[PDB]
Design an enzyme around this catalytic site. Structure first.
Site, PDB file in Angstrom:
ATOM      1  N   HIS B  46      -1.580  -6.262  -4.491  1.00 50.44           N
ATOM      2  CA  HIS B  46      -2.023  -6.019  -3.504  1.00 50.44           C
ATOM      3  C   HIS B  46      -3.586  -5.531  -3.281  1.00 50.44           C
ATOM      4  O   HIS B  46      -3.843  -5.138  -4.832  1.00 50.44           O
ATOM      5  CB  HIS B  46      -0.793  -5.047  -2.463  1.00 50.44           C
ATOM      6  CG  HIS B  46       0.737  -5.862  -3.302  1.00 50.44           C
ATOM      7  ND1 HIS B  46       1.812  -4.678  -3.605  1.00 50.44           N
ATOM      8  CD2 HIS B  46       1.742  -6.077  -2.192  1.00 50.44           C
ATOM      9  CE1 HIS B  46       3.326  -5.573  -3.957  1.00 50.44           C
ATOM     10  NE2 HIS B  46       2.696  -6.672  -3.174  1.00 50.44           N
ATOM     11  N   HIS B  48      -4.489  -2.158  -1.971  1.00 48.13           N
ATOM     12  CA  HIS B  48      -4.448  -0.251  -1.423  1.00 48.13           C
ATOM     13  C   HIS B  48      -5.244  -0.334  -0.839  1.00 48.13           C
ATOM     14  O   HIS B  48      -6.491  -0.854  -0.759  1.00 48.13           O
ATOM     15  CB  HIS B  48      -4.170  -0.038  -2.393  1.00 48.13           C
ATOM     16  CG  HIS B  48      -2.601   0.290  -3.028  1.00 48.13           C
ATOM     17  ND1 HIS B  48      -1.349   0.551  -2.595  1.00 48.13           N
ATOM     18  CD2 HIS B  48      -2.231  -1.342  -3.891  1.00 48.13           C
ATOM     19  CE1 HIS B  48      -0.707  -0.036  -2.653  1.00 48.13           C
ATOM     20  NE2 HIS B  48      -0.857  -1.324  -3.952  1.00 48.13           N
ATOM     21  N   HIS B  63      -0.056   0.251   0.732  1.00 48.47           N
ATOM     22  CA  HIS B  63      -1.092  -1.838   0.922  1.00 48.47           C
ATOM     23  C   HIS B  63      -2.144  -1.151   2.011  1.00 48.47           C
ATOM     24  O   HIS B  63      -2.391  -0.114   3.776  1.00 48.47           O
ATOM     25  CB  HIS B  63       0.230  -1.769   1.157  1.00 48.47           C
ATOM     26  CG  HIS B  63       1.290  -2.164   0.782  1.00 48.47           C
ATOM     27  ND1 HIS B  63       1.938  -3.448   0.676  1.00 48.47           N
ATOM     28  CD2 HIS B  63       1.394  -1.917  -0.924  1.00 48.47           C
ATOM     29  CE1 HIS B  63       2.927  -3.352  -0.663  1.00 48.47           C
ATOM     30  NE2 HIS B  63       2.384  -2.264  -1.411  1.00 48.47           N
ATOM     31  N   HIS B  80       1.319  -7.228   6.294  1.00 47.81           N
ATOM     32  CA  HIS B  80      -0.089  -5.877   5.832  1.00 47.81           C
ATOM     33  C   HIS B  80      -1.568  -7.543   5.400  1.00 47.81           C
ATOM     34  O   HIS B  80      -0.776  -8.414   5.023  1.00 47.81           O
ATOM     35  CB  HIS B  80       0.131  -5.639   4.738  1.00 47.81           C
ATOM     36  CG  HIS B  80       1.052  -4.130   4.936  1.00 47.81           C
ATOM     37  ND1 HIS B  80       2.011  -3.637   3.809  1.00 47.81           N
ATOM     38  CD2 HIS B  80       2.290  -3.548   6.020  1.00 47.81           C
ATOM     39  CE1 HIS B  80       3.377  -2.824   4.662  1.00 47.81           C
ATOM     40  NE2 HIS B  80       2.878  -3.074   5.467  1.00 47.81           N
ATOM     41  N   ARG B 143       2.613   1.016 -10.825  1.00 45.23           N
ATOM     42  CA  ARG B 143       1.294   0.842 -10.593  1.00 45.23           C
ATOM     43  C   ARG B 143       1.179   0.094 -12.000  1.00 45.23           C
ATOM     44  O   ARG B 143       0.640   1.147 -12.488  1.00 45.23           O
ATOM     45  CB  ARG B 143       0.460   1.199  -9.115  1.00 45.23           C
ATOM     46  CG  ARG B 143       0.734   1.350  -8.290  1.00 45.23           C
ATOM     47  CD  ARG B 143       0.046   1.964  -7.570  1.00 45.23           C
ATOM     48  NE  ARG B 143       0.529   1.951  -5.841  1.00 45.23           N
ATOM     49  CZ  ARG B 143      -0.057   2.952  -5.053  1.00 45.23           C
ATOM     50  NH1 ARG B 143      -1.095   3.005  -5.246  1.00 45.23           N
ATOM     51  NH2 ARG B 143       0.925   2.967  -4.328  1.00 45.23           N
TER      52      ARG B 143
HETATM   53 CU   LIG Z   1       1.014  -3.079  -4.156  1.00 48.74          CU
HETATM   54 ZN   LIG Z   2       2.015  -4.652   2.104  1.00 47.45          ZN
END
Ligand SMILES: [Cu+2]
Ligand SMILES: [Zn+2]
Ligand SMILES: [Cu+2]
Ligand SMILES: [Zn+2]
Lengths: 153, 153
Positions: B46, B48, B63, B80, B143
């Site tokens: 993702h 962020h 996100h 997102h 993460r």
């Molecule tokens: Cu993430």
């Molecule tokens: Zn997301």
């Protein structure tokens, strides 16, 4: 009121965090934080063109200079956008940074987000030297640490 | 066209370089590179919201979601802006990444430069996990590595 932040790293003892804050779109940017591990004295401090750390600090390219100007100190009318002058380190190898700058911005064509902040081995001569290099890099020597400038809350 | 680049770093062995390329304003972004040190299988991936790595990947925030939607996969209508799905590592612990995405951008309102790319401990459930956490983060866990997305030559 945008804020940004940079975590400065390299291959030696130089470590730091530098914060950026700009209250209005055409207000000064406050630059502040602390860098430790530096020799006592002055160290050139600049925003460089690329936020590319893939080969360490060398991949950042030259000083950020979107208006194609010569190098100067921060209070010179002739300077690169990224020319933030020198940080000063004490005897305990700490440089406490507290700067207000008129030229860098967190928006528009002077925007520095996504680019690299670099701390140097030696003093920036502020472009006042008797050689052409002075007008390009300030003769500040090797890049000791750096980081990509990112958006902060 | 613009280019950007991200160097992923964490507390364990996960590391790699991800390249971004966008040919046209608000055209698609190609996302490619290689991540090593990952356990075989799917790992959520993702953008962020913050390019803040002062407390490491923790400081990057949630996100990137400027249009206030719920979490989904990258090919979902409801997602997102930061939702890039999963990458897959092989048995030698290597994830080769090649993505094209039309929702992230290197300019304009969906701009991800100065934001943080994160690769996660396990699979993103693509918001179909059947609980509230799924609709927030995809249940992708901790993460493993992140990097701030910087402008490249
Ligand atoms: Cu993430
Ligand atoms: Zn997301
Ligand atoms: Cu420099
Ligand atoms: Zn300069």
């Amino acid at each position: 009121a945008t804020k940004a932040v940079c975590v400065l790293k390299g291959d030696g003892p130089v470590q730091g965090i530098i914060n950026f804050e700009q209250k209005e779109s055409n207000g000064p940017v406050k630059v502040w934080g602390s860098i430790k591990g530096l020799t006592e004295g002055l160290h050139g401090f600049h925003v460089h063109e690329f936020g590319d750390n893939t080969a360490g600090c060398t991949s950042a390219g030259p000083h950020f200079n979107p208006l194609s100007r010569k190098h100067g100190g921060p209070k010179d009318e002739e300077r690169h956008v990224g020319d933030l002058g020198n940080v000063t380190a004490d005897k305990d190898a700490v440089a406490d940074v507290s700067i207000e700058d008129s030229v860098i911005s967190l928006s528009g064509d002077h925007c520095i987000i996504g680019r690299t902040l670099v701390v140097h081995e030696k003093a920036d001569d502020l472009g006042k030297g008797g050689n052409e290099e002075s007008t390009k890099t300030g003769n500040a020597g090797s890049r000791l640490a750096c980081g990509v400038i990112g958006i902060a809350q």
